Amino acid sequence: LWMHKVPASLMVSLGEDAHFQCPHNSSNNANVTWWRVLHGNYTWPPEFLGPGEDPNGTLIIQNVNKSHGGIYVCRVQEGNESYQQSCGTYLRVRQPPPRPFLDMGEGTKNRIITAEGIILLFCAVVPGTLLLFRKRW
Template sequence: MEVKAPHLSCHAVATLLLVVLSVIPSHGLKMLWVPTSISVNPGDNTKIPCNYESQPEEEVEITWSLYKNKVIRSGDNISVYTEVHNLKDNTKDLQIKKVETNQSGLYKCKVKVTVHNISYSSCGTYLRVKDLPVFLFFNVAEATKNRVITAEGILLLFCAIIPGTILLYKKRFENLNVLSLKQSEGENLYEGLNLEDCSMYEDISRGLQATYEDVGALRAGDIQLEKP
């Protein structure tokens, strides 16, 4: 026996679709793009936005949460976990005044449609608090610093070359003067010297003299007196 399926009219199908759509909750909430990160200096004021679109008749609730990564070291083991801090702020843009270093982390907003009890979270914005700026006595640009360093190098080069060159020429002149004096003294060393008046020189014309004689065999005729 063949069983035939019931035939539904177009009107019945349209009515069924309307009933299904009326049962399924519908809303116009849509999350939009937010900045991925924000960098600020300690003590500055900043604002973290929560961008979304919703229908005018829809009531939404906004909550903010701060996610921080904590690192725990136990010997050689390192574990990382995330701390979640719920912030007491229900505004669309989170205002932070006089930011401190411990307020860095990932900020997420959660938007909830109260009628349908549906909520969406943003991708989050990471707030990075910079280190304290270093105090500079002379706050100049990098190009100016490079020019100053170049000028200092040139001055140091001149201060090393000029005095060194002067000292070298001075030492050279002193050596030349000493050498000329030595040459003039060597040429005039024996000038005007009378060998007969100097007792330290032997008269080569006398011939070789005996160093000693036998007193017993000495004769008066053999005595020769040395000329003064």
């Protein structure tokens, strides 16, 4: 069904805004609520986070800090019927990873280092031979 389409992780740095979504199937007559759930077969009740903020079903969270992990679950019900609930989008956060020299990672620098070394050895032998053996004669 549609209870499997949602991803399994989300990547954000602190202080930014994340984006979720819950793809409803009842024609704009349903109710969308967002919850935050514990491990699984939990005992503490889940908490009510926020309602559907815009018509298309998107939740936006700001002011990201260290204590904003955990599973986020969208629960939708149509009037008097039972609710339909996805199985969440785990959220993992850490800001730091830096810039330097984005062009290549360690997977490339070593290869061009070894190529440059072998080419330098190849090119630094002929000049000495030409300078030396062409002087005596």
